[PDB]
Scaffold this motif. Sequence first.
Motif, PDB file in Angstrom:
ATOM      1  N   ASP B 416       0.767  -1.093   0.233  1.00 25.42           N
ATOM      2  CA  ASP B 416      -0.004   0.089  -0.159  1.00 25.42           C
ATOM      3  C   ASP B 416       0.757   1.217  -0.134  1.00 25.42           C
ATOM      4  N   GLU B 417       0.333   2.296  -0.574  1.00 26.90           N
ATOM      5  CA  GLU B 417       1.143   3.602  -0.420  1.00 26.90           C
ATOM      6  C   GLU B 417       1.068   4.280   0.999  1.00 26.90           C
ATOM      7  N   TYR B 418       0.632   3.752   1.851  1.00 26.97           N
ATOM      8  CA  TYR B 418       0.461   4.118   3.068  1.00 26.97           C
ATOM      9  C   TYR B 418       1.137   3.095   4.109  1.00 26.97           C
ATOM     10  N   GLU B 419       2.050   2.266   3.572  1.00 27.92           N
ATOM     11  CA  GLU B 419       2.569   0.994   4.404  1.00 27.92           C
ATOM     12  C   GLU B 419       3.044   1.631   5.558  1.00 27.92           C
ATOM     13  N   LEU B 420       4.173   2.669   5.269  1.00 26.79           N
ATOM     14  CA  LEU B 420       5.303   3.226   6.427  1.00 26.79           C
ATOM     15  C   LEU B 420       4.469   3.750   7.281  1.00 26.79           C
ATOM     16  N   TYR B 421       3.379   4.511   6.832  1.00 29.32           N
ATOM     17  CA  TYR B 421       2.461   5.568   7.729  1.00 29.32           C
ATOM     18  C   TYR B 421       1.782   4.492   8.638  1.00 29.32           C
ATOM     19  N   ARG B 422       1.237   3.448   8.080  1.00 31.61           N
ATOM     20  CA  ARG B 422       0.467   2.324   9.096  1.00 31.61           C
ATOM     21  C   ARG B 422       1.355   1.844   9.989  1.00 31.61           C
ATOM     22  N   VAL B 423       2.381   1.551   9.669  1.00 29.45           N
ATOM     23  CA  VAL B 423       3.691   0.935  10.510  1.00 29.45           C
ATOM     24  C   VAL B 423       3.853   1.682  11.584  1.00 29.45           C
ATOM     25  N   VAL B 424       4.071   3.090  11.399  1.00 27.78           N
ATOM     26  CA  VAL B 424       4.469   4.103  12.288  1.00 27.78           C
ATOM     27  C   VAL B 424       3.303   4.169  13.253  1.00 27.78           C
ATOM     28  N   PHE B 425       1.981   4.128  12.849  1.00 29.79           N
ATOM     29  CA  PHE B 425       0.779   4.289  13.426  1.00 29.79           C
ATOM     30  C   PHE B 425       0.730   3.217  14.354  1.00 29.79           C
TER      31      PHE B 425
END
Lengths: 145, 546, 48
Positions: B416-425
Amino acid sequence: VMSLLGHYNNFFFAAHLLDIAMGVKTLRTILSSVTHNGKQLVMTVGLLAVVVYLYTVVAFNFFRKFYNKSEDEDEPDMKCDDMMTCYLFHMYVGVRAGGGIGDEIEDPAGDEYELYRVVFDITFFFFVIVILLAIIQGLIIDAFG
Amino acid sequence: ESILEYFRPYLGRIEIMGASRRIERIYFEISETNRAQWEMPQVKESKRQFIFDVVNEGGEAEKMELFVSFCEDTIFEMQIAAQISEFWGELEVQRVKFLNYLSRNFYTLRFLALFLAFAINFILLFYKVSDSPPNMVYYFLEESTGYMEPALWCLSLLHTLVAFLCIIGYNCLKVPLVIFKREKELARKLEFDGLYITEQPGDDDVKGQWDRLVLNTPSFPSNYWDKFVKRKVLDKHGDIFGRERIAELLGMDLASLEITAHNERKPDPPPGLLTWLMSIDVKYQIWKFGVIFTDNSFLYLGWYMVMSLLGHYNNFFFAAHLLDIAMGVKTLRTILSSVTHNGKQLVMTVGLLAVVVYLYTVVAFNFFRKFYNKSEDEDEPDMKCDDMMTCYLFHMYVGVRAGGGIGDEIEDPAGDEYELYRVVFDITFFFFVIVILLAIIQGLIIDAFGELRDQQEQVKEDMETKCFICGIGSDYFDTTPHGFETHTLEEHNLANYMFFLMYLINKDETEHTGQESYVWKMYQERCWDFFPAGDCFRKQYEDQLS
Amino acid sequence: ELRDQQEQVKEDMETKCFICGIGSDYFDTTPHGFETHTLEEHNLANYM
Ligand SMILES: Nc1ncnc2c1ncn2[C@@H]1O[C@H](COP(=O)(O)OP(=O)(O)OP(=O)(O)O)[C@@H](O)[C@H]1O
Ligand SMILES: Nc1ncnc2c1ncn2[C@@H]1O[C@H](COP(=O)(O)OP(=O)(O)OP(=O)(O)O)[C@@H](O)[C@H]1O
Ligand SMILES: Cn1c(=O)c2c(ncn2C)n(C)c1=O
Ligand SMILES: [Ca+2]
Ligand SMILES: [Zn+2]
Ligand SMILES: [Zn+2]
């Protein structure tokens, strides 16, 4: 007695492994920290039984249909249709679950008792799991002190 | 030697500051009744509780204030125990026997009620539900004995009756102490502060605003040792703020006091029951009920009543009586006291938990919305974060209780394009909400066990190292062998100060010796100078070797 | 940490005078000696 009974059954010699606890001194001190507040620990698990039973009397009366543990719709397996088995279910599964009882029963979403069950599971998690096991950990934590 | 050994228990020696600031030793007699009632175990428990309250809760200048207050209400306790010790006249004598028996056996009735609650709940452990008789369900007490339902009904009746006797026993045993404390405090505030004469109390002080009911009642100082507090207030603040106003405020009759001074007939005109309806004081009774119905213990016993009655409506209401052990056995009281010591901190911590979980909700709704799918049926998606209310509910209910963070209860963020953002989340959710903000919840009670630790250790250490009365440390007394033991068993003994106050009260005022008259006048004047502070007989006489 | 900081501050106020530093084991020889010393003799409000 255990040495003699080990001749009757060879696995009875496993009970002699506990001799290290009366043997090596550092294990004696670790067990002495555990047993320093032994009465407190026993009364804490007594309080655990009482509060889990207090959750059982309020799960039997209201949240009874949710305690389904059978995917076979032909033969439902209600685990809270009887006080004895519901209390057994709570003490055996709900205490040992990582979350409260809320992760071991039916999803409360889409029901007239949704908010009541949310309060039920959250308070079960907050009082029985994170508080009343932190006391069990804290008695020996303080015993090391 | 034989005389001294026989009169060893009854010879009480204390030390007072006296005139010219010279510590003087006073000898007197403790009667056998006084010593026995003081060694009664309830008074021992009260003494230990008072000692903890003084040493732990603080107070150095007011230590003797608190000690003498303890003396007063302990004397009231021993009077109560002596009172309760083992047609109309027949009814009255049977009634007072009943009340005295309940008051003596109050604690055993409390234990009996606890035992009955356990028995009733053990019976309830056999309840079962079926749709068939024993859309509408049926609760039946499934059992093999055949006697269990009659046992339940009999035990329910017995439990309600025992709880009623507990209410009555409490009302006739522990309530007089509460009344005595309240009226003692009111009398001190009236005489030495003028809290209703010259300095009115605050509006939010419900105690001060409620005490006004009892001022003008004719029976204000009942269950209190003096009855002339009204006259002392009139003599003290009467000439400044107005004698007639004092009379109106205190319900006083200026002429009638002076006529009862010179002649006081004491007949008993009405013999019947109607005197108990006529001589009753309605306003004082209203005040008394207001005092008891706000006490924590009596409200707990009243709620015990309410649950016992409601248990007849539904038998499972008797489960609420299992919590009586928490107010019962002492070790469970201390465990709950550790939990409740930092209760405000715990509540604010879960408030912070709600705030931070909501802060994660506002950032999961806006960005990570598609991931909150809880339906494997592709025909009917079940987005649990398409609405603030249900997304916040999802986070608070599932994400907090999950072993990991929210990351194990939603869609896999891989690919997903938000993979790193969700990992941080998810990682920050796990790190702040799960491992940190629940460690605070565990740590508050972890540290509370240290609280009660250090309180008991500090109290015991303070008793061991310093004298409770004089305050001189044991590093001084132990110079002589067993010096501190001697100092706190003979010279300064708080039990001996108990007995001195009792002995002054009992002794005829005209028969007091000089030293006893000195101590008596500052007991009435309430000037605690005679307690030896920072000095003792041994310290006073060293060149002469005591 | 915060435990012992608050307890140390309160204890230090209780046992020693903030200005002179003489311990209360000296002043309390006279009744209410430390109370008098920190309400009349050395009072930081009075130095204000
Ligand atoms: N002035 C004092 N009066 C009484 N006790 C004092 C005084 N000063 C110090 N103490 C200490 O108070 C402690 C009280 O413990 P003690 O053994 O006397 O009580 P107890 O008789 O067991 O009491 P209880 O029946 O309440 O348990 C003693 O160890 C003693 O050293
Ligand atoms: N030189 C000093 N000046 C002032 N206080 C001192 C001094 N030495 C010691 N102290 C101690 O400082 C403490 C300050 O507490 P105090 O009760 O006087 O404060 P307060 O009036 O309640 O203050 P606030 O309004 O800041 O809460 C006193 O208990 C006192 O014993
Ligand atoms: C101080 N005080 C009491 O404490 C007391 C008393 N009479 C009884 N008590 C309890 N008297 C007359 C008294 O002066
Ligand atoms: Ca004389
Ligand atoms: Zn002394
Ligand atoms: Zn100073």
